[PDB]
Ligand binder design. Structure first.
Ligand code: FEC
Ligand code: FEC
Ligand code: FEC
Ligand code: FE
Ligand code: FE
Ligand code: FE
Ligand code: FE
Ligand code: FE
Ligand code: FE
Lengths: 170, 170, 170, 170, 170, 170
């Protein structure tokens, strides 16, 4: 394809990935609100920190799309599942991070095929972070399934802070 | 009304307010990508910083909804408009902050009528921030209208940094 | 109503609120002695710390009553229940904080109707603290119900210190 | 008496003393509110600091009672006198601290007779503090009676702070 | 009412409140010149410091009026009374702070009825400061009435400094 | 004239000057509110700092009048002009500072003629500050008239802080 076709194909998968990140942000923050509500502080905090990673992803995809002359999507991909119990949160999140790694690997190939090394490197870096999220999710789901209440007793009442408050406008 | 009644009614205006915040996060960040693309750094920076204020809003609303036994919504209210020109960006955002304020004040009244001092207090606080945001967009909107390209020449190539990067999981 | 009228009516709800705080100080400290006796240190510590918040409440109420020309009551409202078991302690206290909040909100309305913005403000502030207290007791109540003895095993033998001792006269 | 009878007799006088302390706390704080209201800062502050000493007493008696297998009273002993003038505050407080020392000395003897050295040492220590309160009260009542207005002119407008605010829950 | 309507009505009570603050600045400073002339330093100092609080009030009101599209008034409400004797100074100022509070509370109600949460919040804040001022003047008024010249003898020749001088242009 | 006549003539021009300063304070603060509203921060800030200089003047005149046995006026001299545009603010302020220097020089002569060296030195010092204000005003009015929008583009969005907040009573 010519210069314009190669950017358009790339912009396509970038918006595809962006949509997945927009879903993850809403999905992982939804669970954080429950975890926090359940007073599982350490779980609540790390869930929020992973959501903020996905925020950075959505932000990085957007910027790349702009460099390519495209418009970054505002629609999330899929529906958000609410009211999940602690066990189901980690099983579903693990499944999602695995699916996302899978999808992103396929987008990375499209980038290579359109001869776009900068976008490909973006996907490589963000895939490595996705892997770290997947490991985390798998570990927690394991301790929950294999140890139940004894494990959660240690999480009960733990601190949920994610640090100093977000530098905002006001 | 009864207990469950009062709570339900307040959860409802909180979810409306929250849906409004979800929209503003996406609307504002879309403009930030544009402003960052045009290389108006300081404009891009402040836009992003107000979006992060709106994210905190959404969060505070979701936390109060959880306290009332409700489910925090995940759907934004309204459509995000893309491709806006710089002057339209500040004319639309002023209108939105003003509409939001008008709305929140209506929600606030419902909280007083439903006997919920804690939620009304949250609305009062967030409305003053919204006022800080409205003042900001009117001012910029104002400089662009009176000074046009002379003002922009001053913003062109300014730093776009919002400070240290996102404290996340990785 | 007239001046003396408005003041009298507000002094009245303040003395009711204050009597409610006197009860809670005694009720909560009684449970603290129990919790400290069973050697659930962290539970005993936080219980005592909330009682001290209730003491500050009583104080603030008495100071406002004095400002209005009234006499701060010295009688608690209701009877202190002793011998409660750990789960009853957190089920009863949640109910009390919730009832208190319901009450204070009623008192607040009287202050607005009597044109007393300063007293209404004091009620607003103390109601948010009461909400912090209600959230606390529901959480603990929640951990005990879901996790039972596994949770307690984690609290057994923890420090009971509330920090430095009482700054006093001697 | 046997082991149980000796603890019960001790618990009796301990609850007796506790009831006196619960009265003193309400009585001395009542006067503090007046002193503060009268803008006699140094008098107001020291009255509050002595009330907090009595709080510690009520707390120490309670803990000892628990160690003995008893239930710490929640009822104060006697009625609280309100609206006393500056002179009458110090004359009555002196009389009360003297009566309390007298009573406590008699409880101490009961402790010795029940062969309870730990409770006896508690009373000895708390009696020494009561003496310090009595001296203070006597001194102020003396300066008031012997010097009146000139003495109080120096107290007018003095600071009433008792230090940094009480470590609480919120 | 409509937009322009709600704003106009609030601008009106703000300009009344502001005119009241302009009066108090002049009234209070006039007394400060007197008190400074009689060499009651501490009295002169605090009077000036409350006037500066009233200046901040006028400022905050003018800033909110500007936010509503209005013009901040420049005329004080009422006449400044000169030559007052020390006791009249504190009897009149107590009455004024009390009248002001009564007024502001009325203005506040108008803001609620006009749906203006930000202006009502400003009134709420300034009314608590006015209460701090009212408490001050009653206390001093009180010391002068109970203690007369003995109190003044204590103030005579005290420092009149309000701290570092006015950060200005030169 | 005799001792009393010389103080009275001096007090006359001192109240005359004081009245001018009371006008300047209201006039310069009025413009500050507009400049701030226009988001011309550096202009807004310096206008406020010059108003505070005029406050010090009004304060110094008052104190001198008191030393002379007089009563310091509470009436401003003239009417305040509102709603001026940026250009007209600086042209009028320049004219006012020039007129004030002119008037004050004439009052200074009256002081010399009444043989009052202390009041004369006051006028000399305050005249030197007036000169600094006049220079400032002239410079800004020059840049506005000669360079317009390009100059103001640099002022747009600048900080308006005048430093740490005014040491007040509360
Ligand atoms: C809460 C919450 C939501 C709502 C989720 C929900 O469903 O409730 C929420 C929603 C979003 C959404 C959409 C986006 C995506 C924007 C877009 O691309 O359209 C989105 C995007 C971002 N957020 Fe976000 N958020 N958010 C925080 C909280 C929330 N945020 C906190 C706190 C921080 C503070 C981070 C820090 O200071 O380090 C924070 C930071 C960011 C950054 C900045 C990252 C960086 O510069 O490195 C970006 C970009
Ligand atoms: C105010 C007020 C009242 C109500 C009196 C009234 O009649 O208005 C008031 C009432 C009580 C009453 C009952 C008790 C007795 C509890 C019981 O044994 O049932 C009672 C008991 C305690 N108070 Fe209390 N209070 N109180 C403070 C203020 C007030 N307090 C402030 C402030 C501090 C802060 C002290 C500090 O941080 O150093 C503080 C601390 C304590 C401690 C902690 C001592 C320690 O650990 O060394 C105990 C125990
Ligand atoms: C705002 C505002 C107004 C209302 C104007 C308007 O028209 O809106 C306003 C009005 C007045 C008026 C009359 C006077 C004259 C009093 C008289 O002589 O009757 C008047 C007088 C004074 N002000 Fe004033 N003000 N004002 C501030 C703000 C405002 N002030 C801020 C802020 C500071 C803080 C200064 C600092 O901390 O360094 C401050 C300080 C002073 C000092 C203290 C100077 C010194 O001790 O060196 C004097 C005297
Ligand atoms: Fe991820
Ligand atoms: Fe906003
Ligand atoms: Fe509470
Ligand atoms: Fe004592
Ligand atoms: Fe005041
Ligand atoms: Fe000047």
């Amino acid at each position: 394809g010519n210069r314009e076709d190669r950017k358009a194909k790339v912009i396509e998968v970038l918006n595809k990935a962006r949509a997945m990140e927009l879903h993850a942000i809403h999905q992982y923050m939804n669970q954080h609100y429950s975890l926090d509500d359940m007073d599982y502080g350490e779980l609540a905090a790390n869930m929020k920190l992973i959501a903020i990673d996905e925020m950075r992803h959505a932000e990085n995809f957007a910027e790349r799309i702009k460099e390519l002359g495209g418009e970054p999507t505002t629609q999330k991909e899929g529906k958000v599942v609410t009211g999940q119990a602690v066990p189901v949160i980690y099983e579903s999140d693990a499944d999602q991070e695995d699916a996302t790694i899978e999808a992103y690997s396929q987008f990375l190939k499209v980038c290579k095929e359109q001869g776009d090394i900068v976008t490909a490197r973006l996907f490589e870096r963000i895939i490595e972070e996705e892997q770290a999220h997947l490991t985390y999710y798998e570990n927690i789901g394991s301790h929950i399934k294999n140890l139940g209440d004894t494990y959660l007793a240690k999480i009960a009442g733990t601190p949920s802070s994610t640090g100093t408050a977000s530098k905002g406008f006001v």
